[PDB]
Design an enzyme around this catalytic site. Structure first.
Site, PDB file in Angstrom:
ATOM      1  N   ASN A 119       0.854  -1.188   0.000  1.00 34.03           N
ATOM      2  CA  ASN A 119       0.000   0.000   0.000  1.00 34.03           C
ATOM      3  C   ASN A 119       0.889   1.237   0.000  1.00 34.03           C
ATOM      4  OD1 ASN A 119      -1.975   1.921   0.236  1.00 34.03           O
ATOM      5  ND2 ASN A 119      -2.786   1.192   2.196  1.00 34.03           N
TER       6      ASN A 119
ATOM      7  N   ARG B 186      16.704   1.291   2.345  1.00 35.19           N
ATOM      8  CA  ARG B 186      15.720   1.659   3.352  1.00 35.19           C
ATOM      9  C   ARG B 186      16.254   2.662   4.361  1.00 35.19           C
ATOM     10  NH1 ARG B 186      11.501  -3.154   4.213  1.00 35.19           N
ATOM     11  NH2 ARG B 186       9.676  -1.780   4.327  1.00 35.19           N
TER      12      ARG B 186
ATOM     13  N   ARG C  32      15.010   6.110  -0.397  1.00 36.90           N
ATOM     14  CA  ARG C  32      15.041   5.664  -1.782  1.00 36.90           C
ATOM     15  C   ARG C  32      14.357   4.320  -1.994  1.00 36.90           C
ATOM     16  NH1 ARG C  32      16.980   9.351  -5.888  1.00 36.90           N
ATOM     17  NH2 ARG C  32      18.386  10.785  -4.792  1.00 36.90           N
TER      18      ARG C  32
ATOM     19  N   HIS D 284      17.435   0.617 -10.159  1.00 35.34           N
ATOM     20  CA  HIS D 284      18.099   1.731 -10.823  1.00 35.34           C
ATOM     21  C   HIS D 284      18.841   2.644  -9.859  1.00 35.34           C
ATOM     22  CE1 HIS D 284      14.621   3.817  -9.273  1.00 35.34           C
ATOM     23  NE2 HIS D 284      15.068   4.973  -9.730  1.00 35.34           N
TER      24      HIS D 284
ATOM     25  N   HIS E  27      23.001  12.340  -2.102  1.00 32.45           N
ATOM     26  CA  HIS E  27      23.414  13.239  -3.175  1.00 32.45           C
ATOM     27  C   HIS E  27      24.778  13.870  -2.947  1.00 32.45           C
ATOM     28  CE1 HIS E  27      23.142  15.795  -6.629  1.00 32.45           C
ATOM     29  NE2 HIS E  27      23.208  16.895  -5.902  1.00 32.45           N
TER      30      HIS E  27
ATOM     31  N   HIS F 169      26.593   7.344  -9.470  1.00 29.88           N
ATOM     32  CA  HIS F 169      25.777   6.387  -8.734  1.00 29.88           C
ATOM     33  C   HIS F 169      25.207   5.287  -9.622  1.00 29.88           C
ATOM     34  CE1 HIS F 169      22.738   9.187 -10.278  1.00 29.88           C
ATOM     35  NE2 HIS F 169      21.846   8.231 -10.088  1.00 29.88           N
TER      36      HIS F 169
ATOM     37  N   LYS G 118      -0.771  17.124 -28.970  1.00 25.11           N
ATOM     38  CA  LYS G 118      -1.368  18.135 -28.107  1.00 25.11           C
ATOM     39  C   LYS G 118      -0.763  18.144 -26.709  1.00 25.11           C
ATOM     40  CE  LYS G 118      -5.580  17.410 -26.584  1.00 25.11           C
ATOM     41  NZ  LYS G 118      -7.027  17.061 -26.494  1.00 25.11           N
TER      42      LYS G 118
ATOM     43  N   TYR H 135      15.369  21.616  -3.888  1.00 17.68           N
ATOM     44  CA  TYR H 135      16.625  20.903  -4.080  1.00 17.68           C
ATOM     45  C   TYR H 135      17.837  21.819  -4.061  1.00 17.68           C
ATOM     46  CZ  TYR H 135      13.267  17.515  -5.954  1.00 17.68           C
ATOM     47  OH  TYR H 135      12.196  16.679  -6.146  1.00 17.68           O
ATOM     48  N   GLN H 136      17.651  23.119  -4.287  1.00 20.38           N
ATOM     49  CA  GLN H 136      18.753  24.071  -4.242  1.00 20.38           C
ATOM     50  C   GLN H 136      18.552  25.095  -3.134  1.00 20.38           C
ATOM     51  OE1 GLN H 136      21.224  22.945  -5.976  1.00 20.38           O
ATOM     52  NE2 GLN H 136      19.700  21.462  -6.682  1.00 20.38           N
TER      53      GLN H 136
HETATM   54  N1  LIG Z   1      -5.804  17.191 -17.336  1.00 24.26           N
HETATM   55  C1  LIG Z   1      -6.117  17.704 -18.527  1.00 24.26           C
HETATM   56  N2  LIG Z   1      -5.167  18.481 -19.134  1.00 24.26           N
HETATM   57  C2  LIG Z   1      -5.305  19.086 -20.365  1.00 24.26           C
HETATM   58  O1  LIG Z   1      -4.389  19.756 -20.838  1.00 24.26           O
HETATM   59  C3  LIG Z   1      -6.571  18.819 -20.955  1.00 24.26           C
HETATM   60  N3  LIG Z   1      -7.112  19.229 -22.161  1.00 24.26           N
HETATM   61  C4  LIG Z   1      -8.304  18.682 -22.184  1.00 24.26           C
HETATM   62  N4  LIG Z   1      -8.578  17.936 -21.068  1.00 24.26           N
HETATM   63  C5  LIG Z   1      -9.800  17.164 -20.761  1.00 24.26           C
HETATM   64  C6  LIG Z   1     -11.065  17.692 -21.418  1.00 24.26           C
HETATM   65  C7  LIG Z   1     -11.895  16.426 -21.558  1.00 24.26           C
HETATM   66  O2  LIG Z   1     -12.548  16.104 -20.330  1.00 24.26           O
HETATM   67  C8  LIG Z   1     -10.835  15.376 -21.875  1.00 24.26           C
HETATM   68  C9  LIG Z   1     -10.594  15.155 -23.347  1.00 24.26           C
HETATM   69  O3  LIG Z   1      -9.787  16.235 -23.853  1.00 24.26           O
HETATM   70  P1  LIG Z   1      -9.015  16.136 -25.225  1.00 24.26           P
HETATM   71  O4  LIG Z   1      -8.584  17.589 -25.586  1.00 24.26           O
HETATM   72  S1  LIG Z   1      -7.550  14.928 -25.265  1.00 24.26           S
HETATM   73  O5  LIG Z   1     -10.182  15.762 -26.220  1.00 24.26           O
HETATM   74  P2  LIG Z   1     -10.618  16.257 -27.669  1.00 24.26           P
HETATM   75  O6  LIG Z   1     -11.093  17.654 -27.668  1.00 24.26           O
HETATM   76  O7  LIG Z   1     -11.595  15.225 -28.224  1.00 24.26           O
HETATM   77  O8  LIG Z   1      -9.268  16.109 -28.498  1.00 24.26           O
HETATM   78  P3  LIG Z   1      -8.939  15.374 -29.874  1.00 24.26           P
HETATM   79  O9  LIG Z   1      -8.613  16.505 -30.847  1.00 24.26           O
HETATM   80  O10 LIG Z   1      -7.829  14.402 -29.704  1.00 24.26           O
HETATM   81  O11 LIG Z   1     -10.261  14.726 -30.286  1.00 24.26           O
HETATM   82  O12 LIG Z   1      -9.619  15.845 -21.251  1.00 24.26           O
HETATM   83  C10 LIG Z   1      -7.463  18.025 -20.271  1.00 24.26           C
HETATM   84  N5  LIG Z   1      -7.304  17.443 -19.069  1.00 24.26           N
HETATM   85  N1  LIG Z   2      -5.291   0.838   2.651  1.00 21.97           N
HETATM   86  C1  LIG Z   2      -4.965  -0.219   3.398  1.00 21.97           C
HETATM   87  N2  LIG Z   2      -5.923  -0.689   4.254  1.00 21.97           N
HETATM   88  C2  LIG Z   2      -5.774  -1.773   5.095  1.00 21.97           C
HETATM   89  O1  LIG Z   2      -6.698  -2.133   5.821  1.00 21.97           O
HETATM   90  C3  LIG Z   2      -4.486  -2.364   4.981  1.00 21.97           C
HETATM   91  N3  LIG Z   2      -3.927  -3.449   5.634  1.00 21.97           N
HETATM   92  C4  LIG Z   2      -2.718  -3.543   5.133  1.00 21.97           C
HETATM   93  N4  LIG Z   2      -2.449  -2.588   4.189  1.00 21.97           N
HETATM   94  C5  LIG Z   2      -1.213  -2.401   3.402  1.00 21.97           C
HETATM   95  C6  LIG Z   2       0.052  -2.902   4.083  1.00 21.97           C
HETATM   96  C7  LIG Z   2       0.925  -3.264   2.890  1.00 21.97           C
HETATM   97  O2  LIG Z   2       1.556  -2.103   2.349  1.00 21.97           O
HETATM   98  C8  LIG Z   2      -0.094  -3.814   1.897  1.00 21.97           C
HETATM   99  C9  LIG Z   2      -0.292  -5.305   1.965  1.00 21.97           C
HETATM  100  O3  LIG Z   2      -1.119  -5.614   3.103  1.00 21.97           O
HETATM  101  P1  LIG Z   2      -1.853  -7.002   3.258  1.00 21.97           P
HETATM  102  O4  LIG Z   2      -2.319  -7.083   4.742  1.00 21.97           O
HETATM  103  S1  LIG Z   2      -3.279  -7.324   2.045  1.00 21.97           S
HETATM  104  O5  LIG Z   2      -0.650  -8.015   3.117  1.00 21.97           O
HETATM  105  P2  LIG Z   2      -0.194  -9.324   3.900  1.00 21.97           P
HETATM  106  O6  LIG Z   2       0.238  -9.034   5.280  1.00 21.97           O
HETATM  107  O7  LIG Z   2       0.829 -10.041   3.022  1.00 21.97           O
HETATM  108  O8  LIG Z   2      -1.517 -10.207   3.884  1.00 21.97           O
HETATM  109  P3  LIG Z   2      -1.789 -11.711   3.427  1.00 21.97           P
HETATM  110  O9  LIG Z   2      -2.125 -12.452   4.720  1.00 21.97           O
HETATM  111  O10 LIG Z   2      -2.872 -11.770   2.414  1.00 21.97           O
HETATM  112  O11 LIG Z   2      -0.437 -12.201   2.908  1.00 21.97           O
HETATM  113  O12 LIG Z   2      -1.340  -3.147   2.203  1.00 21.97           O
HETATM  114  C10 LIG Z   2      -3.586  -1.823   4.091  1.00 21.97           C
HETATM  115  N5  LIG Z   2      -3.757  -0.765   3.278  1.00 21.97           N
END
Ligand SMILES: Nc1nc(=O)c2ncn([C@H]3C[C@H](O)[C@@H](CO[P@@](=O)(S)OP(=O)(O)OP(=O)(O)O)O3)c2[nH]1
Ligand SMILES: Nc1nc(=O)c2ncn([C@H]3C[C@H](O)[C@@H](CO[P@@](=O)(S)OP(=O)(O)OP(=O)(O)O)O3)c2[nH]1
Ligand SMILES: Nc1nc(=O)c2ncn([C@H]3C[C@H](O)[C@@H](CO[P@@](=O)(S)OP(=O)(O)OP(=O)(O)O)O3)c2[nH]1
EC number: 3.1.5.-
Lengths: 487, 487, 487, 487
Positions: free
Chosen positions: C7, C33, C52, C94, C103, C121, C242, C262-263
């Site tokens: 998670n 870690r 990281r 990586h 760094h 690195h 676009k 970062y700076q």
């Molecule tokens: N997050 C985001 N950033 C943007 O820069 C942006 N521009 C539009 N949208 C939203 C607006 C809409 O909810 C959706 C689609 O926008 P699209 O421009 S890809 O669609 P068409 O006009 O059909 O372009 P095409 O010429 O390829 O047919 O994304 C955006 N959503």
């Molecule tokens: N959002 C969220 N809600 C929760 O209730 C929760 N519980 C854990 N995690 C996070 C913690 C970890 O980042 C991830 C995995 O948790 P998982 O409990 S499914 O894993 P295992 O222990 O392996 O259970 P298994 O008995 O099936 O092997 O989800 C959670 N994340």
């Protein structure tokens, strides 16, 4: 009259003074509850379904917060609760006058419905404020809470629109709302000197939160890093000297929001077509004005009793109308309903230093239809089938750097204001702050007409020495080789 | 017909199949663009200005995502693109039939406008789907993309409403939409067995994002931890055995959202008053039906040509009407505009195991007005001045635990389904899943009437052995000492 | 070996292949870690306490998502699960080789501890990957899951670092990891052609989420708008035409993050002082290498058995050491603990086209101490008390536009790639992509020394025709009038 | 000494008084910079890499905000800047004394390393505060800013731990920090009456933001709806009467966070194994105390000069140690590094009203190993191979409802406090507030041992009439049919 709280999604909980509660609980303010802030953007971004009511409340809250913080930081400014209430009222009532869908009425419908009149939404907001005050009997309540209406109302009007009686042009601040020592209060709600104001911050945050885009500005940091300092013998709000980068980032965020959402192709064409429907339905829509008078859509900006009922409702009035007179407008609105929109053709970028003014906006289709492409075209088009859409991208000041009119203070001297030039911040900043982009659309939905319109548009762009379209080598690859400079 | 993408604020970018694009681009679907999802909540929460269009798109997208994930995880289920398209279409068109403001029409207006008819919004959605398909000529397009309309349409209708011809009650799945081996497809859009479905998740996320509240559910984790397993000889969607706590949290989130936003006092009273305005304006509003017929607001649920134009528009129709016939409804709407709302009095909690049915809802004011408080009252009230509002809080299943009808799987046996009882999860879970709460309001705005109404309400609560109101010792401290059990 | 889920806070739930689970569950990976991603930024931004490990997991997940989406969109590319696993492994591994604080070791400590060696690195990550594979016996597990280790390991190394045996410079792709037709797989984890890769997106999102800044990029939209297209006879990943504005916005976001976090001034000076402490403590810290060998901090980059234990731990080793040999380094670290940092003086901007190379970094304090200000100075300073810090701000490509090396596709032709120039996008874009900024610090904490250092720095800036400092008229107002060009 | 600002990710920008800046810039406070708030949760949730430094800063900021808001709302309380500074200092220095990994040291390591001593982290924080004040010479600075150290230090200690000299038990507030009229100041940082305090809110928000879970609480709404009201002749902080649901939601959020993240299976077992490694390495780790004295890990809680250096560093001390004495602890830590953890067996729920006390925690494995399942077991286990882990889930008050000790005020009477019972809020609230859950683990990693341990655990659960395990019918289906009550 106890203080009331509202749970805003952007600003959390907002506390409202009883005078503000009385001002909002009027028809002239609840009229904003039915006007979309993004008119044509709702038909491109499904989530952009927010009105101007929330925006007005947020701008008022932010103005109150900024003035309260400035007063707390510098007790010597002598900021009273009267000034706080006045700036809050200016914040809430800064967008009282908006047409349906809130932008095409102000910038596209009125300039075509009646080009003779020069009308802007700030004037309408001022007149609606006057009508609200007079009709609802607010002046006794204003006097009850320590406000002097005769000058406070003038102060609020000056905040909303500026110099009322005449442009200053002389007399060295002949203003009648607040004295010279309170010159920093004319910048909290609508800053007309550099554009940095709570209105910008509020619609930034709200539009980003609703469209689905992420915001790149933090207004709280600016609030914590802003001080009032004497500048050229008047008190102006100054920012910390390390915030120039964040201010440039704010203007870049404005530019990006305009580029991505406010100037969308589909949104612009849908706004144009709703404007055309309104123009066709103008002569058959009557709004009951004052004293039983009847007003049209275009003539309702002359009587606020009628203008109080001119909201986004007329769209569904035309759409659901059974009157045979409104048939053409109803057909246009139904074409919108079926998403049979006008088809996109292309965009361009003027390269000459001279830009085409609004007086020549309607003459562009005539020149577009006059192109003579040297390609095998089986259909000839007419200017009636061509639509142009000129868009101006700026920083709030057309040719001037908005940061060039901002004063900064430093930690060593928290009361001396200085000017920071562009070259003293970074060399990775825009070299120009004004650009123009022209769209072209076609009203036909057949592929042959699309091909013909694309050829005409590309030839027109090549004729006037415009920029190469971003896809000129695919949609029309037979014209770009002629333009040697483009390759 | 190329695939289209929309930038939703909750689900980011959503890709829509061309059949879906054709289905949405019809008047019967764009009708949802003008119907608020929270009718009376917009007048309490300013940010709750979202319609059912976005909700329908999101529910369709989530249904598609869930079915695609289930198909990817278990290739042996034999899920084809036909099933994906059908469940998506059921998701988009699950809320086609909604009245204005989307909830008072279904639950308050129709039961009072015409109590004889039994109408629910799912039936209206089914009829609007039929009208959309027939009017827009969708069947050729459905056949173009590999869908068999004769049975796919029945499958979609069964998804939206359930068994079409008759309740099953025999014959062991006599269904006509999908075979027995596809029994897990009747739970993706509207789960009628335990209530866990993409509709709940979508309105959870959207309402939390718009109101200003924070959501306490993660649907992606449930999607990643859900598998189809044979249960009592049919394939049901089963969740991971460690997700029972998260499912209980989901139902708790639903309860909290209902408590805080959907059952607000001011929102409920505003919905009641708009319903009263609609009831008063019913006889003078005419909607043009099919073939020139004229339909009222209440009778427009019998002809979908008229019902296509019955949106939130009638509110502004009544508000802006100059017809003297609509005067009373216009006055009620203007009272809403001035926030001269009916005044809150108090709430109560029934204690007996027997709850009052909807048949006795209108008889409560008569008993309220019949109270005889032993306090000095200078004004006597009438049942006409009293409004009651009964609210039922549940988990989607009135008296039954919704988790008691959910099957779980474990890591050791990913194909065996088991039942988890409440006592096997935690001892800190609710002991009851059904509760009833009754509000009381007053139509007068004078403090003497408020005092009289409060005394009457407190005496009525003490008479029928109800719970002590949360502030019974302050508003009416002269009655609580009589109730020995209350102290 | 069942699939495992984690998670993550940025990417929600992440599913990991059993081979990935085996690769991470080794000391060479859990070593990450305990290495902060932002070394000196944790002492300026309290929330920036992320290592990281999370970044590596997120980069692996994003690489897997991108390759899976590209395979789904174009089945003709023939992307097998082997390629998916290989690109995922390249994503996780990586950043295996990072010094303490991640760094300053790579860019400040090693260049001063041993200037003769050229170390980066990526080389350390490659050697740690080799050591991990050899020590943990991963090759049998790789062969168990269909991977061919002899060439898959070479492919992973080529992904991490590029051409292994020698720079290409001839032979037209003499690579040994993947054939020519899979040329689009060398850009998912670390794109060396234009810089657009999942690593950038992941640290963008994570750093914004942890520092407290808001992100201005959406990687999901780029994923949905990216296709593999033949470019100059090799398959390169291309973006939608676009999306050029969004790509420029991504690079602007990178620039803003570098500028703001970062700076940072305090972060940079703290990193410098920790580097000085490490340099002073180098001779007395011994790390047990391979076969009982003893290695210093600076010489531990020659034996990965020792380098596995060279983490952020040495900071607390020096801080808590009672050895009198480490006294000077312990005193420096305690000065950090008391926030008795070196004092800021000023910044500058070189204006000439020629920038000062890294070979002249240490010669700057000598020139700074040689300044002769014409002000009354009562104390003379030495180059030992002066610290310079040269920072280079770029777009990932020093002098070249990164978007100039990106290929775009359009809706009409989804398989033809085109180039978009800067002037075809907007005129409001940066005219330069490389800038240099030099900081100056003082090691003494007395106000007289601060004044003397400020005067020396201002005189030095005026001497070499550098930019005017943003506050040159306040801290040192007696020198700016001499610079006529500055006023 | 100018005011300083920090950019926190949860609370935005935080302004710190110069006295606070002096207090934090000491080794005794920066010691918290290297102690994880979630010790074993970092090895289950990768994003949970936040220390106690940020949490302390946030708790101080929230305490300051709450006290400032309470003072602004009621000027009659006479809250001076001295009280604000004192409550802020109590907020920052409330977690000064924490062991490595911050929870196993306080609750698992010390009770096993030295069961005779009764030690809690509040006592360690008090002693570290004393050491900080004495070593850094803070009292002159406290007197410089208007604080009276002789009583202000006692007030801060009383805030952190409560009655210093002795439990009250008589004398009717014999306290020595603040008078009776300031009784509301003992609840802002650590509320010992009902548990509602800024510490809970801060770690709620921070843990939700870092783990990846979503928070279901809004502290700003509680701040805006809280007033000081006289209760039983002392001033206590009271909440609005409509906030009882939100308070119950806050406690439910605490329960859910404990259930999902703080009581995770893998996190608990990893904390247990690190505790075992510390116990094995105790005798060979020496920390230089005061005056050259040498202290062990377990004995360093008796000298704060040594305890200042007892951070999470000892984990990497043991892990990287080449000393043959620390071999067993190093092997345990490397087993953690390889994720060769102890294997899960099952959980249970005691059903009797009597719960097992901490005195019987170590006797449970003896009874577990004594089980005699009637199944074919080929291997016999020993109590040495069994680990039990008892977890107590509560609301901050073990058997008592925390809301039963909260006073509420209403709008009609903003100064009269009332008590709200559980039945007056809802019937959908938990009937019990205390539950106990016992985990069981196995130290061997062979499937036969897993089967044997599961059989033993299931038989033990069936023996003592415990609850049916959530998967008792799959892992061990041969024992559940014997338990007739379980089916
Ligand atoms: N997050 C985001 N950033 C943007 O820069 C942006 N521009 C539009 N949208 C939203 C607006 C809409 O909810 C959706 C689609 O926008 P699209 O421009 S890809 O669609 P068409 O006009 O059909 O372009 P095409 O010429 O390829 O047919 O994304 C955006 N959503
Ligand atoms: N959002 C969220 N809600 C929760 O209730 C929760 N519980 C854990 N995690 C996070 C913690 C970890 O980042 C991830 C995995 O948790 P998982 O409990 S499914 O894993 P295992 O222990 O392996 O259970 P298994 O008995 O099936 O092997 O989800 C959670 N994340
Ligand atoms: N959001 C944000 N944006 C930024 O651009 C930024 N820069 C820093 N911070 C964070 C980092 C810290 O958490 C906090 C303080 O940074 P500040 O730069 S105002 O502080 P000093 O170095 O003391 O500057 P001064 O020269 O006035 O003394 O804000 C920032 N936070």
């Amino acid at each position: 009259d106890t203080m009331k709280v509202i749970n805003d999604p952007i600003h959390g909980h907002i506390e409202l003074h009883p005078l503000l509660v009385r001002i909002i609980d009027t028809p002239q303010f609840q009229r904003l509850r039915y006007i979309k802030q993004l008119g044509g953007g709702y038909y491109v971004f499904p989530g952009a379904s927010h009105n101007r009511f929330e925006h007005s409340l947020g701008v008022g809250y932010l103005a109150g917060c900024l003035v309260h913080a400035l007063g707390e930081k510098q007790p010597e400014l002598q900021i009273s609760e009267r000034d706080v209430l006045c700036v809050q009222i200016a914040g809430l009532c800064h967008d009282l006058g908006h047409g349906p869908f809130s932008h095409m009425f102000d910038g596209r419908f009125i300039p075509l419905a009646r080009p003779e009149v020069k009308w802007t939404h700030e004037q309408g907001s001022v007149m609606m404020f006057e009508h609200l005050i007079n009709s609802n009997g607010i002046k006794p309540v204003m006097e009850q809470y320590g406000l002097i209406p005769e000058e406070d109302i003038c102060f609020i009007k000056e905040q909303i629109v500026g110099p009322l009686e005449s442009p200053v042009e002389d007399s060295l601040w002949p203003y009648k709302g607040r004295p010279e020592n309170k010159s920093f209060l004319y910048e909290i709600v609508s800053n007309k000197r550099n554009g940095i104001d709570v209105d910008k911050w509020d619609y930034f945050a709200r539009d980003c939160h609703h469209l689905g885009i992420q915001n790149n500005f933090d207004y709280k940091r600016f609030i914590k890093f802003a001080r009032v300092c004497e500048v050229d013998n008047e008190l102006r709000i100054c920012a910390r000297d390390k915030e120039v980068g964040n201010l440039y980032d704010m203007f870049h965020t404005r530019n990006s929001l305009h580029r991505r959402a406010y100037q969308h192709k589909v949104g612009n064409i849908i706004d144009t077509m709703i404007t055309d429907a309104f123009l066709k339905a103008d002569d058959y829509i009557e709004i009951t004005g004052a004293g039983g008078k009847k007003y049209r859509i275009s003539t309702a900006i002359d009587d606020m009793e009628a203008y109080t009922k001119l909201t986004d409702n007329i769209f569904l009035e035309i759409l659901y109308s059974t009157d045979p007179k409104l048939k053409d407008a109803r057909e246009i609105l139904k074409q919108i309903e079926y998403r049979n929109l006008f088809k996109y053709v292309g965009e361009t970028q003027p390269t000459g230093q001279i830009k085409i003014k609004r007086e020549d906006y309607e003459s562009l289709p005539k020149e577009v239809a006059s192109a003579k492409p040297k390609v095998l075209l089986d259909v000839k088009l007419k200017a009636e089938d061509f639509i142009v859409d000129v868009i101006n991208m700026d920083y709030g000041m057309q040719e001037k750097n908005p940061i060039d009119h901002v004063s900064f203070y430093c930690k060593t001297a928290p009361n001396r204001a200085i000017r920071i030039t562009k070259n003293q911040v970074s060399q990775l900043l825009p070299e120009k702050f004004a650009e123009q982009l022209i769209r072209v659309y076609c009203k036909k939905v057949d592929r042959k007409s699309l091909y013909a319109a694309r050829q005409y548009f590309v030839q027109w762009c090549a004729d006037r020495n415009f920029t190469k379209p971003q896809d000129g080598d695919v949609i029309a690859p037979l014209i770009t080789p002629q333009k040697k400079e483009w390759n």
